[PDB]
Amino acid sequence: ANVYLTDSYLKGVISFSECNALGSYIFNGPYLKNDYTNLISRQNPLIEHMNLKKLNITQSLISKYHKGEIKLEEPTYFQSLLMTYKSMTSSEQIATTNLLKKIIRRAIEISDVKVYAILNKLGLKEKDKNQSHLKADKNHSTKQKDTIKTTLLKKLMCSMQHPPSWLIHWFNLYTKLNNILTQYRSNEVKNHGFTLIDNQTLSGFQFILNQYGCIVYHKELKRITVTTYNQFLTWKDISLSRLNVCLITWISNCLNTLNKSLGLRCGFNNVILTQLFLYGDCILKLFHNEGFYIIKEVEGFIMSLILNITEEDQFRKRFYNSMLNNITDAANKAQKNLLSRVCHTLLDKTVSDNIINGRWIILLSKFLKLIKLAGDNNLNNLSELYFLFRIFGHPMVDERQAMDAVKINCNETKFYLLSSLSMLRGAFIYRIIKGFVNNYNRWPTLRNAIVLPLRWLTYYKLNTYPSLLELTERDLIVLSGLRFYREFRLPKKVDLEMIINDKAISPPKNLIWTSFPRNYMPSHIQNYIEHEKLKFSESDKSRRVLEYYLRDNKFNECDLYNCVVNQSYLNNPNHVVSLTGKERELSVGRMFAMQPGMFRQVQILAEKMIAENILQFFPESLISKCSIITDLSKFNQAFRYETSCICSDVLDELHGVQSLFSWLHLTIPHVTIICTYRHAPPYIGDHIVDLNNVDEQSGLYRYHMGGIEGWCQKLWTIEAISLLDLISLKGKFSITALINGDNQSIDISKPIRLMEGQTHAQADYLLALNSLKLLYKEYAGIGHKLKGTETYISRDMQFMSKTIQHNGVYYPASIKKVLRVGPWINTILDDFKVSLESIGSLTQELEYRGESLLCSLIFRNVWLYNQIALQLKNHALCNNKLYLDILKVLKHLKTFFNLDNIDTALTLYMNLPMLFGGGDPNLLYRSFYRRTPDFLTEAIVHSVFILSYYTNHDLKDKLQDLSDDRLNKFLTCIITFDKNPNAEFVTLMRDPQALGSERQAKITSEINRLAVTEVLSTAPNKIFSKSAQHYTTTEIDLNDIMQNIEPTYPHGLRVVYESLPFYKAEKIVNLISGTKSITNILEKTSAIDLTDIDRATEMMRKNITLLIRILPLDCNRDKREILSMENLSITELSKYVRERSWSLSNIVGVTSPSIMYTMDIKYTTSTISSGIIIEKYNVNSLTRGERGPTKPWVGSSTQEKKTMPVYNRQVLTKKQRDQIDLLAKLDWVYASIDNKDEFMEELSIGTLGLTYEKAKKLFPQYLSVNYLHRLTVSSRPCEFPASIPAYRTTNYHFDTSPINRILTEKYGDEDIDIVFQNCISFGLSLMSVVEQFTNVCPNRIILIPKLNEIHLMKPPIFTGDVDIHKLKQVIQKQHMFLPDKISLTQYVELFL
């Protein structure tokens, strides 16, 4: 017996053939579309549908339908009904209103601690600058003042007491659908194969719900429908999205009523939003399933409404009209397609008369006018109005009809003129030559140098290239004929990391019939399946990749590099590319493809070689002016062999291989492209056992001859940029291109200002028109016809990365981002820590972009309090264990301190950080800056600030006297504890920031590592088997290696860890350690094992209860000596904790001081006038949303200076250069070690083929003496940005000399601990938050450091020696992950 945990959110695609195959059986007639599915379903019904119909209540429904008392319906109709939940009694509405008032009052109270701490540390207690009526109450004011200490929130809490109706509406929809879902999930985890029958939860409806299908019945309107489980998940998600929108707008409106700057920048009247949603559902009901075409194409309306505000007249009208025409064309296509589809089926009467009559235009007009009104001629409202794209459900996508159009478009004949292809290839080779010259100061080697004019031989003899403006057209054809010698070598050993992934792959051709259920396939096909299953190996008859590599019996490391050169992938007998409808977007769009495993290897290899070598040559790929924006979907299919392979042959030739990058067009035309969804089987006829004889249908076709979406995208980016170069050559305008793979942006400049004709604009308009003519002509001459639907011309407006920027100002679409934020968001097996982390991250993203703090704060605490208090009881695996444990923790915190009630304990629990087992997802610094080198100091400063709420403190300095010793008790209980260190060095290597000694909670990978190791030990693959069996002792050797050395530097240990061939094994393991299914992969069942659930719930209970272990109340009389509050440098405390936890003598270079605690805020200049000064150069009242003079500021940490040797790095692999750099860092950091020569000898001989001395010629030697201050590892933070968006930082200016004066007079001209970037970053964020709270931005701000916590730092001297024998053993035990050895021929051709 195994459980089946189900999804809580969509996480997938809604299906069409599923609904069809269910309804056709239940109602014994074609339900959605006449197709082969109905025949094959009625003839051979599936099991689970047989069970669903076998029930008695659905049989009563069928009997009531046959008589004709109820009429069938479309799922979208019931979506429209459920949304307009008119049936609401008074008592349930009262209950929900009380519940919402409770959730609100509790969520406002939790954030009070953080707001109070901020307002203290800021010193902004002064000059802070229905509500009055319910403020002036006696008892209500007392009940508020019981636990709220900031007037800024007293006013807000009083103002938010009476919520509006629509909020309550969406709230109760959410809670009821959520209750149905969670009840089903729990009862399913308990008893398997359970169907939920409900008719009293949602008043008036009736659900027969199950994992395999759902049936909804409404008696008073006597309608019935059949849907899938995903559809019900989607209805829940729609309700949730609308709830979130309403909550956010509610909070923002109240806050903005308080002050103009607090809330978000957007205003909305929720009545308009509700009418808007309702009209959307109305359209969706009118056009049953084709309404999503209309709703998609509506997207142009908002772009036009913005161009009305940001563009001149001509482009304005042009875009307006094109968009209108596209909308109406979409509507007509939808209507005709619906009438064609539903012509002969059960739902033939449901088509409304308003479609035929022609009166849907008035409805569509009203909807568009409501959008226009909700915009209300503002750039903000219009920018954040994009969420409408998300609210309504995702369409039911059908597989078959999605391919046929692509078939019609794909296989055809294209004609090109020879000059076109020739000049394209000429531009390509020009780009490659320019890249080589500007990179290596060397021209690539050629074999056909004879064919070259003298004017070009003089360019070859001297290593330089001609510029672009001088170059002509005809010369390109001259440059079309050349050949190259090998320049880039090919990696020989397969890299196991990039290739392994959880995504699925299709079975080989001869076996593909095992994707369709046993019932649907006919008799003889099943007989052939059974008779042939044995011929193939156990490896390739695998559904996924993890299995495919975990079952390779004959798996050779040189197999791939032998195969890519022996050309075994061409003319292959079993090759089939199967399209599955799992691509997820609002339009039907496309559906993505899957090959067998081997070809997937080859394709990944091609893309990897390009990304490593070539894409470095085209940096574009990630005064009359005109920008042109082009959609680049459907750009793939137009490609043919010639157009792509002429340019691909150059890369193929450079790499020395034959037909590597040209595989796609060389083998795809032969193979049979079929659709493989479980419920969509193609009619097979009889006596046909393989695909190459099946007769073509609506399902499968052949002779593609065109790119398949997604594969080899880099080739098409490259060739597009080359073609664009050619265009610039013919048109004579300075061009620039930006291709991200989804939208191509081409900007044009031409020097014909001061030469204008009697107008300063409307000449660039003619430039636009002429350039667009030339571009249409060019792309059409290449063979890809460009439609007027994709491209559009603009001058001052550019949509980039779906972000709107105008006049150098950014406009953020936050509400879209935080749209779905719920109880178990982003979880795997219903975690608690991960859920809290994800909620914190999404809401902090709101605060970073939307430019509002208090809104994000209250909105985060709402859902945090929800998941903690209300919905923690109802949990899948464990019934009440987590609630009991959190109640224990709350009672414990109540006893430890002097908190009055469990409620106040919940407050102080929701404010404590997660490092100490608290509930605060994201610390108090993340508001002010983004990165920091160490966490523990920030945890301690945060907890100090939080505890400063209950105990009164100044926070300007350390108060000598504390009457209430809560903070001091907390500190003395955090410093004093026992020591239990085990495996300290390997742990300090994997995570350099770790504490250990059981003072911090353990994450899932560390727990599951042993189980994954054991199950990997029994794997038919020799590689994984050996490296899993030997996995335990290597940890011991790694622990003992760096043990002797006395001074311990963690990051240095990290480099030692990365250089050794154990990093890749750990990666491959803790990759698998993330999936919910472990110990069960080899048995190929989706269900999980129970012992995994047990370990998960045990670790959850322990991580929850951790706070007692960290903060025990027993050590009050055990140790009554409490530390004083006189000086109390917190960096010393953090160093003490990190050292005692591991019991080491001294750990150096890992504790940077907390900049929030260090600096102090001050406005009036003094005689000192020290510390960094930040002043704004613009003079305004409020700078929010107004750009300033200066360039932006991104904090860039100080680099490391190194001298590179002289040699040709071209003939070398990526991993080898990486390893040489790592070994260089080691030579730099371990000069003081005594075994140096022997230790480096062993390392260089093990990782590389070279001996040390020769190897030393390649090591880039570092010139910086201090590596503590300057080093580069994946563990250290690389840049230190600010919270506020980039554009706002331009408005200020920072001067850092006055602090440098004192920092240089005392401890002069030496490196100091504090990192300087975060100082000015915190300054900028501080300016912004002050502007939000006081509403008047300060003129100048000054930051004075605290002269205590700024410690020294000097490059230490190491003592002790390393263990070389165990190091050699480590490198010997796991040799498969070693990077390739530098052969002798390679090293001899190096120096030339």
């Binding site: 009209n321 209108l324 909308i327 007509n332 235009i361 007009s365 006018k369 294209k414 003129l417 001859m705």
Partner: protein
């Protein structure tokens, strides 16, 4: 010098003829034949017989009217309509435009009606 320059000019005449002949070529993409059972190889021919084949439908193509006009270097109808001062609206689009402007609240539209 008469003889050497005469030979040189004959050389250049033949050579420019060859160059023009090459610039004239058109090459057709690979594809499947009618009654598709195999792939026909890519064939290259002079323009004229190619356009003749396009005209007499010897090769399956989606659109033929644009191809012949494009090979004849002339700008077709669509292209001009694609690059103009303004785009001619549709009739139904004209109805939408007239219903968008003139907000006289004459919709008399009931949400329950729709």
């Amino acid at each position: 010098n008469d003889n050497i320059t005469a030979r040189l000019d004959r050389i250049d005449e033949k050579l420019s003829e060859i160059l023009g002949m090459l610039h004239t070529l058109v090459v057709a993409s690979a594809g499947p034949t009618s009654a598709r059972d195999g792939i026909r190889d890519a064939m290259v021919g002079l323009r004229e017989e190619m356009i003749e084949k396009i005209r007499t439908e010897a090769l399956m193509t989606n659109d033929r009217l644009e191809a012949m006009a494009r090979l004849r270097n002339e700008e077709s109808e669509k292209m001009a309509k694609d690059t103009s001062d303004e785009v001619s609206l549709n009739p139904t689009s004209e109805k939408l435009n007239n219903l968008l402007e003139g907000n006289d609240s004459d919709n008399d539209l009931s949400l329950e009606d729709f």
